[PDB]
């Protein structure tokens, strides 16, 4: 159960914004150009 729960919480943590406008990479890359997208994606990369 501990192993399964660790993996499942890892999966669920992908939904957490880390100070970024959204946790969905595709949404960010669809709305924002290279620079602002880079800022948001850097936040997401740090969090993940």
């Amino acid at each position: 159960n501990q192993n399964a729960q660790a993996l499942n919480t890892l999966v669920k943590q992908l939904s957490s914004n880390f100070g970024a406008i959204s946790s969905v990479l595709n949404d960010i890359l669809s709305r924002l150009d290279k620079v602002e997208a880079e800022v948001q994606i850097d936040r997401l990369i740090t969090g993940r």
């Binding site: 999966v11 669920k12 992908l14 939904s15 406008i21 946790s23 969905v24 595709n26 949404d27 890359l29 669809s30 709305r31 924002l32 150009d33 602002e36 997208a37």
Partner: protein, 289 residues
């Protein structure tokens, strides 16, 4: 790696009413600003290039260079006229007479602000006093809320009659003259507000749709939401007000086709563990996988 491109936008044939909004014959006062809904059209704003020059163009929540590749939900255009000095107040987080008592933008505004000088038509040699703004009010307006009441104002907050010494009418008239300075010249402002990638949309950028390819890794663009994945038929039943579906990870895992209304599941292209067995690079360059 994806090999093909799928683009699915809804059946839209008409151009958006750029001439009706940005080229209207009359504009409201800022205190009585008017809102107009926009739907079922192509937002090919390059047509504006030949007709309109914008002193101010600022977009929030979206990059200016992505507008051509998106579809917009709940599109509204708010139109009014202000002073040149007051144009800076049409933006989130501002203070001043306009942002306090006439027109307030939300902190989380998504959309764009366009302003352009209108001295030639909105100003006269004799002075045009048709445009107004509220100069006194008991408290500040809430975002996107309107107050067109005209009742006498008293700073003590009691019923009022104009003659009394502590009594003022709360609406002031802009005086727009031809010989005015740039800060006292009329500017027409259009605020476009919309949501982008969370609901059905009927206003779309000028893009060409392709055939729906299924069971193949593709680069897809559904109503402006881009990604890479494999599309399959879905058993999910979306409500009419739902356009996208998300899993526990917030990944967009389903979508309703804009044209056929079919529900399609989206899956990642990459999958499966791989390992490499080697006897040592010095011994050999042959590997097993």
């Amino acid at each position: 790696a994806p090999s093909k491109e799928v683009v699915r936008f809804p059946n839209i044939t008409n151009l958006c009413p750029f001439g009706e909004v940005f080229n209207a014959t009359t504009f409201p006062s800022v205190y009585a600003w008017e809102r107009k809904r926009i739907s079922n059209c192509v937002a090919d704003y390059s047509v504006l290039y030949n007709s309109t020059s914008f002193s101010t163009f600022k977009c929030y929540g979206v990059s200016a260079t992505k507008l051509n590749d998106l579809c917009f939900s709940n599109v509204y255009a708010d139109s009014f006229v202000v002073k040149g000095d007051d144009v800076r107040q049409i933006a989130p987080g501002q203070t001043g007479v306009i942002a306090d008592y006439n027109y307030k933008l939300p902190d989380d505004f998504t959309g764009c602000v366009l302003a352009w000088n209108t001295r030639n038509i909105d100003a006269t040699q004799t002075g045009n006093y048709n445009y107004k703004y509220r100069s006194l009010r008991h408290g500040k307006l809430r975002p996107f809320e309107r107050d067109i009441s005209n009742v006498p104002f008293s700073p003590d907050g009691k019923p009022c009659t104009p003659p009394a010494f502590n009594c003022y009418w709360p609406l002031n008239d802009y005086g727009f003259y031809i010989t005015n300075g740039i800060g006292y010249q009329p500017y027409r402002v259009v605020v476009l507000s919309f949501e982008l990638l969370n609901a059905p949309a009927t206003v779309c950028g000028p893009k060409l749709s392709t055939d729906l390819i299924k069971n193949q890794c593709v680069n897809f663009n559904f109503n402006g939401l881009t990604g890479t994945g494999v599309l399959t038929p879905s058993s999910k039943r979306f409500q009419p007000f739902q356009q996208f579906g998300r899993d526990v990870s917030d990944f967009t895992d389903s979508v309703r086709d804009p044209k056929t209304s079919e529900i399609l599941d989206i899956s990642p292209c990459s999958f499966g563990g791989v390992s490499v067995i080697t006897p040592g690079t010095n011994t050999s360059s042959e590997v097993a996988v």
